[PDB]
């Protein structure tokens, strides 16, 4: 149900990409974005909490990402390193969290 | 820092095992326990809120689990399908969460 997609799906090097997000839940505490295919705090880019509206970088944060209040993740001056899979956990207050994976390709 | 450890490490099928949890961070708002090596809501056993004490069964819930305020998980009438790996996510209120993976062996 929860999905993410990249606009565009194919991204020239050095140009922008937007990771969009769809079918969020009714009710969420916040979002966590991760590089690659699985939830892992060693590959966390950012945590975001809606109520205070508070982003915090994790270790995988490059400095070129911007998370928006609807979960969307912008990346500018994208690099070969950015290419491929991203992963998004929606955190809920009842601890039953939802997760999604998407990607884009760099050329 | 956050760790988990099985007691006992080897469990006779039909007996009990207790998953001890050490070094909870400060400023957390709940727990998730997942079956396996990875955080993944498809194999979740429970999400638990520490303020309200509500434990919510996930897909991987058997009925034999009991979860404590300090995050420890007891499992009773241990089957063979309970063997191996369990993974813990501590939900932090900055969403810069933490994870831990321990195991046990049935016989
Ligand atoms: C280039 C950066 C501009 C701002 C990025 C935020 C774009 C908004 O984001 C989009 O909004 C739509 C309606 O709210 C939703 O349907 C999409 O799923 C969502 O990701
Ligand atoms: C059947 C008994 C179940 C009661 C809950 C288990 C007791 C809580 O576990 C306690 O916390 C940590 C590991 O869990 C350690 O720091 C402590 O030694 C341990 O007593």
Author numbering:
A (entry chain B), B (entry chain A): 1 to 107
The authors write:
Human CEACAM1 (hCEACAM1) is a single pass type I transmembrane protein expressed as 12 alternatively spliced isoforms that all contain an N-terminal V set fold of the immunoglobulin superfamily (IgV) ectodomain followed by up to three type 2 constant immunoglobulin (IgC2) ectodomains (A1, B, A2), a transmembrane sequence, and a signaling cytoplasmic domain. CEACAM1 function is triggered by intercellular or trans binding of the IgV domain, resulting in higher order surface CEACAM1 oligomerization and subsequent intracellular signal transduction. In contrast to other immunoreceptors such as the T cell inhibitory and mucin domain-containing protein 3 (TIM-3), programmed cell death protein 1 (PD-1), and programmed death-ligand 1 (PD-L1), CEACAM1 serves as its own primary ligand, owing to high affinity homophilic interactions of its unique IgV domain, as well as an important microbial receptor. The displaced CC′ loop forms a cleft with the FG loop that exposes the key residues F29, S32, Y34, V39, G41, Q44, Q89, I91, N97, and E99 critical in mediating homophilic CEACAM1 interactions.
The low resolution (3.1 Å) of the I91A mutant structure limits atomic level comparison with the WT homodimer and therefore provides a more global assessment on the structural properties of the I91 residue. The I91A IgV domain adopts a GFCC′-mediated homodimer with RMSD of 0.6 Å (over 1489 atoms) compared to the WT homodimer with fewer hydrogen bonded (12 vs 17 for I99A and WT, respectively) and weaker hydrophobic interactions (specially for residue F29).
